[PDB]
Design a protein around this ligand. Sequence first.
Ligand SMILES: OC[C@H]1O[C@@H](O[C@H]2[C@H](O)[C@@H](O)[C@H](O)O[C@@H]2CO)[C@H](O)[C@@H](O)[C@H]1O
Lengths: 131, 131
Amino acid sequence: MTGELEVKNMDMKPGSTLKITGSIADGTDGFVINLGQGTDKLNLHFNPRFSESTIVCNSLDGSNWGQEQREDHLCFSPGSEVKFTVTFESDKFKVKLPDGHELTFPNRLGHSHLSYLSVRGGFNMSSFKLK
Amino acid sequence: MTGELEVKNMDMKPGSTLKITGSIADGTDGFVINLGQGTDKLNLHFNPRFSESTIVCNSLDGSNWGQEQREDHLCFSPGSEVKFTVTFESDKFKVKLPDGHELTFPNRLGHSHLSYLSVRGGFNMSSFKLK
Ligand SMILES: OC[C@H]1O[C@@H](O[C@H]2[C@H](O)[C@@H](O)[C@H](O)O[C@@H]2CO)[C@H](O)[C@@H](O)[C@H]1O
């Protein structure tokens, strides 16, 4: 749980962008970027899985997971230092990948401000900036 | 509470540096950057007070505040975008102010790594970077 950052009481409004930098650990099979209103309401569950060569995106409403969206476009490595840019729109999430490719994921949980960011698995966030 | 950012489960070790950027809200009497083990274990309580033209540094162990240390080097103004760099040593904290002046504050709460950051008052943190 150490190094598994959670950022609370953010105020992410539609149109804002979040840039995340960190290093992926040697020997990790995947990691998670969770962004939403809290531990119980995840608008965006962003889960690259190196062992499955895919990126799963999903939403979480309470204890009920939404329908998973897999994006076979996993073009970064374990053991690297990478950047993610998440854009919060009222209808969609816009995740720029370290290679310039962009994933889009529908926002299924309304237009509320985003206050909760958490990192799971083998990703050590070294910087974040919010605009 | 909205906008009062919390960063939990950091891994800030002796020798590590924390660079925080943000904007001071207009007409505020002060703001707070807290660094420590948790909400009740604050190794560094960094509190610029513009109503008092001084920067208060203190520690919090449970419900017990230490002795305040005031530094009459408050040379930034509300509405401005300031940047602080906090360097964590087992012996003391070093806070580089926006004009370069370095403040020292003793670590009274043990060498144990820093995992908790919180911001209060008229400060909206826009970025941090751990190095
Ligand atoms: O929605 C993904 C989410 O749930 C877990 O993954 C599922 C898995 O995708 C599913 O095929 C299997 O039946 O159960 C797992 C757990 O319910 C993950 O643990 C988590 O990482 C999330 O990504």
